[PDB]
Amino acid sequence: MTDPMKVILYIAMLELEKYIMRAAAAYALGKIGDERAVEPLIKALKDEDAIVRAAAADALGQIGDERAVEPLIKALKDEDGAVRVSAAVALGQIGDERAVEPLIKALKDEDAVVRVAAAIALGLIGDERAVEPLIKALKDEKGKVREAAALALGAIGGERVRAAMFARKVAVNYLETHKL
Amino acid sequence: MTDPMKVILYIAMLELEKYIMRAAAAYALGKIGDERAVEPLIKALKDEDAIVRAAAADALGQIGDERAVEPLIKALKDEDGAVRVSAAVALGQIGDERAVEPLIKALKDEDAVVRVAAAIALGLIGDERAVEPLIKALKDEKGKVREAAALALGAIGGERVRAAMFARKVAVNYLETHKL
Amino acid sequence: MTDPMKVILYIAMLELEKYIMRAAAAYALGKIGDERAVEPLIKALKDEDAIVRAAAADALGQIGDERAVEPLIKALKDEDGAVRVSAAVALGQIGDERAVEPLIKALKDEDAVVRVAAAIALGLIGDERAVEPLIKALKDEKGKVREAAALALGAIGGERVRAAMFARKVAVNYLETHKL
């Protein structure tokens, strides 16, 4: 089975009645990385089942096609926290600067998992506009949100991060990391 | 854990109450490829849960053991479209000529996903009896069915396909492909 | 995405409402192998959904951190057979001798799948205390339990196994195996 065959087959399987088969298809298309799946998966972002929407968003992140930026920014407002997580991470992996301001807003999402996801996505994008919000997130009441904000700050780097550089131990290791 | 251990364990897990665990087991046995799983997975083709039946059929396709041909041809008549998809593809990957006529019939299945799956399976088998039906499928009302029929025709190749060689663009690229 | 990011993200996803997303997270952490996930997955061993508990136990087996021994021995008493399977195998992969006596008891679990799982885990641990029980398991009414006991005996090896070495064909191949 050539990869073109797989893509056509798994794209067609996005219309199967079982939500599990649709999510497995969306995940498969993500692994292959063929851009023929982008618009179909963008449509899958409106699937009735949240599991399908999360899989489609996660797959679009793998493919890394900028066409999915605006739909995934719309997906950031999904009712299901799992979907907002995948949308956030998928936007980080895509790396398009357009996702920064919607992600900064996601950084105050009520769901701490979404906040964690929002923190990491900003680190992947690397836009310096995320430094200040990420430092405020180092004060988050949820420990895992803080850890995510620290890792994201390290991923950005840059002179501005060096300037700004729990929070004490992060910068110390960051500064020692920076010198090394 | 040696692969023999895995096979015995995942074969035993085909009897767990959770349909998800049974499908995950069937999928695992498919990845290992040990033929000890063939008859158990042939039995799994009658599992109550369609997800299990699709996983067992997909796994049998991976193993490529001709013992699964007749049961999978029976699986082609399954009530659940996802199961008929896996049965069709599994028969294509197995490549046994016995599956041609049942697959040609599947090429007119009401479910377009099944038709897509039927088209690709015939391309994998490579039997020239599928040329004429596949050309009629190039006129399918569903675009993805046509694309599948074109790819399948290219996979068969052969002088007869060259003789016969949307439809216009397929043969042109096919003929230019053929010369190159 | 650096592996530290993934770990923090998938650890955070152990709190998503969808049991599927929690199990997928637990499985992901298992593949990465980062020990930051051990205590979170130990907590996941009490998840309401059996699928999550089985995934967390299976992931802990992959990580191989001895901290999971006592919780997984407690997991061996889980109401759901799939969970007891994963707990048993996870203890085998961890290889801690403390799991031998609880596994020997699991070898008489009413669920034959659990017995299969218990047999293999003892083979992975290699503790000679399992020889006698494993030989009695060669008389199990379930064929797959016997096959598992034979493979486990071969994995232990040792002079004591050589001393002791369906059952006839196992030792013959074992003795011929031993000489070769």
Numbering used by the authors:
A (entry chain A), B (entry chain A), C (entry chain A): 1 to 165, 175 to 189
The authors write:
We sought to develop a general computational method for de novo designing protein nanoparticles with geometries tailored to present antigens of interest, focusing specifically on the prefusion conformations of the trimeric viral glycoproteins HIV-1 Env (BG505 SOSIP), influenza hemagglutinin (H1 HA), and respiratory syncytial virus (RSV) F (DS-Cav1). In the first step, we de novo designed antigen-tailored trimers, featuring N termini geometrically matched to the C termini of the viral glycoproteins. In the second step, we generated tetrahedral, octahedral, and icosahedral two-component nanoparticles by designing secondary interfaces between a designed trimer (fusion component) and a de novo homo-oligomer (assembly component). This design approach yielded nanoparticles tailored to present 4, 8, or 20 copies of the viral glycoproteins in defined geometries.
We chose to design our antigen-tailored trimers from monomeric repeat proteins composed of rigidly packed 20- to 50-residue tandem repeat units, as their high stability and tunable length (through variation of repeat number) are desirable properties for the design of protein-based nanomaterials. Geometrically compatible docks (non-clashing termini separation distances of 15 Å or less) were subjected to full Rosetta C3-symmetric interface design and filtering, and twenty-three designs were selected for experimental characterization. Four of the designs that were trimeric and expressed in high yield, 1na0C3_2, 3ltjC3_1v2, 3ltjC3_11, and HR04C3_5v2, were selected for solution small angle X-ray scattering (SAXS) experiments. The proteins exhibited scattering profiles very similar to those computed from the corresponding design models, suggesting similar supramolecular configuration. Crystals were obtained for the two designs 1na0C3_2 and 3ltjC3_1v2. Structures were determined at resolutions of 2.6 and 2.3 Å, revealing a backbone root mean square deviation (r.m.s.d.) between the design model and structure of 1.4 and 0.8 Å, respectively. The structures confirmed in both cases that the designed proteins adopt the intended trimeric configurations, and that most of the atomic details at the de novo designed interfaces are recapitulated.
